[PDB]
């Protein structure tokens, strides 16, 4: 209730979130402790500092007029509140594939350059975090213009959602489903970074005279910063500058209203006309929702950064850390073979759900990881050594039948070993989704932890089929294919 009490709690939260990593075994304990301080501050504040009297659909007409006055397409689509994805665009006419149906000029966008020329300019030129973090600079740019009643982007800000499904909005028990998974660490870092950045910039705004002219000095609640960073991470683009020197982050009105579907990237930027463009990924009939393809991101990135779980994600993947140990007898040769192939000695690879399960780089690593001494010499010496390295990532030309049997045996054992590290099984996860009534945010976490295990289980079956196949070629002594 008192400004001095908030200054005390933010300074305590700043010191709590600035401490180093407490170790993987204590990250959940620190996460609950940080939530306790954040919720204590949030329950003492008044939510969003700037609220609007009308509903969200009431401001879309002003968004269409404001965009039309600056040369953006406003015909052929309408805003419809869909249940599955939220608000989106629906075609009012038939749209054929590869048809340019949406263009947004540069003037309508909110970029890092427009943040430097705004009221945040003076503080941007002095604060080191804003200069190095363009995403954070975009968030405060969105907050300052939101608190500016006469802002140029007011028709756009009044149409943004007031809440998101990022893990920052999850409850403690909803994040609890992600225990013993790979994704929960990124949820911990996201909550710790957001809590630290808010407490830091709250103290700077109240003390640094360069922020005295900012409207955030009158009111800057945690709900404002959680809404700001969530609006950025779920909607921001990476576009080139007006001259094409470097890249920059931007909020693109109208274009960021299309929801995600599987396909190819059809949203591009035209530098000659200085505008964002979107062509139809597929044929949209009148009355159908207009979808685009966001990117080849995994469901873990869609949940944490985009705020939704996408079923049938063709690019879903899990991480797997592999490396050659220095205690290996053949470490010197294996490190040299990998170095000549452009592959590190130890890295974090990926396991994909769709075929093939392993990429060309991971296959080349697993082959060298299981090579004998004779096979390592043939990749290091002679006139045909460079030719052998050139085909390490090709599944058609193996090193030997024995090399394939050993690499697929190792992958089947490693993927099965990672499956035993989760606190639940695949059958138990499917049982919860069927016999329990859950929220959307709870379903996102359970289907995320289930998706990790389904990718691991398919890798076990894929490695077992390959292991048994190359075992037959080894038992029958079949001739090895030669790349000619």
């Amino acid at each position: 209730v008192s400004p001095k009490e908030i200054l005390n709690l933010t300074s305590e939260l700043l010191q709590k979130c600035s401490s180093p990593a407490p170790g993987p075994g204590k990250e959940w304990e620190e996460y609950v402790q940080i939530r306790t301080l954040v919720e204590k501050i949030r329950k003492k504040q008044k939510g969003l500092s700037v609220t609007f009297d009308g509903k969200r659909e009431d401001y879309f007409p002003d968004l269409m007029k404001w965009a039309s006055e600056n040369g953006a397409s406003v015909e052929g689509f309408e805003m419809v509140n869909f249940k599955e994805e939220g608000f989106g665009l629906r075609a009012t006419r038939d749209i054929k594939a590869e048809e340019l149906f949406l263009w947004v000029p540069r003037k309508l966008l909110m970029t890092v350059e427009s943040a430097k020329n705004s009221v945040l300019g003076p503080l941007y030129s002095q604060d080191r975090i804003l200069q190095a973090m363009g995403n954070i600079a975009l968030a405060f740019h969105l907050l300052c213009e939101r608190a500016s009643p006469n802002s140029f982007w007011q028709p756009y800000i009044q149409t943004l959602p007031s809440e998101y499904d990022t893990p920052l909005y999850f409850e403690e028990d909803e994040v609890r489903y992600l225990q013993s998974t790979q994704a929960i660490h990124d949820v911990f870092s996201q909550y710790k970074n957001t809590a630290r950045q808010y407490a830091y910039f709250y103290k700077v705004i109240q003390t640094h005279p360069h922020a005295n002219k900012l409207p955030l000095k009158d009111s800057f609640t945690y709900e404002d910063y959680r809404w700001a960073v969530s609006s950025v991470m779920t909607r921001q683009f990476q576009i080139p500058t007006e001259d094409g020197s470097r890249v920059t982050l931007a909020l693109i009105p109208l274009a960021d209203m299309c929801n995600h579907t599987n396909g190819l990237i059809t949203t591009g930027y035209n530098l000659e006309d200085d505008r964002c463009e979107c062509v139809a990924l597929q044929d949209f009939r009148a009355g159908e929702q207009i979808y685009i393809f966001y990117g080849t991101r995994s469901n873990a990135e869609f949940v944490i950064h985009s705020g939704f779980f996408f079923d049938n994600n063709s690019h879903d993947r899990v991480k797997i850390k592999l490396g050659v140990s220095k205690s290996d007898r053949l470490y010197a040769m294996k490190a040299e073979v990998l170095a000549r192939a452009g592959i590190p000695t130890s890295s974090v690879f990926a396991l994909h759900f769709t075929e093939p399960p392993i990429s060309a780089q991971l296959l080349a690593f697993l082959r060298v990881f299981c090579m004998t001494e004779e096979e390592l010499k043939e990749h290091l010496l002679g006139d045909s050594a460079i030719d052998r390295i050139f085909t390490l990532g090709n599944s058609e030309f193996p090193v030997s039948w024995d090399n394939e049997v050993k690499l697929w045996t190792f992958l089947e054992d490693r993927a099965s070993l990672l499956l035993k590290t989760y606190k639940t099984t695949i059958e138990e996860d499917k049982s919860v989704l069927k016999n329990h009534d859950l929220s959307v945010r709870a379903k996102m976490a359970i289907k995320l932890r289930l998706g990790e295990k389904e990718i691991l289980e398919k890798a076990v079956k894929s490695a077992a089929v390959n292991r048994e196949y190359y075992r037959q070629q080894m038992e029958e002594k079949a001739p090895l294919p030669k790349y000619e």
């Binding site: 995403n135 779920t234 591009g268 930027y269 035209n270 950064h305």
Partner: peptide, 18 residues
């Protein structure tokens, strides 16, 4: 294809200490 394909909601780095 496209000259400058852009990604909706591209993953960025928010770790200010990294």
């Amino acid at each position: 294809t496209l000259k400058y394909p852009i990604e909706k909601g591209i993953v960025t780095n928010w770790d200010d200490m990294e």
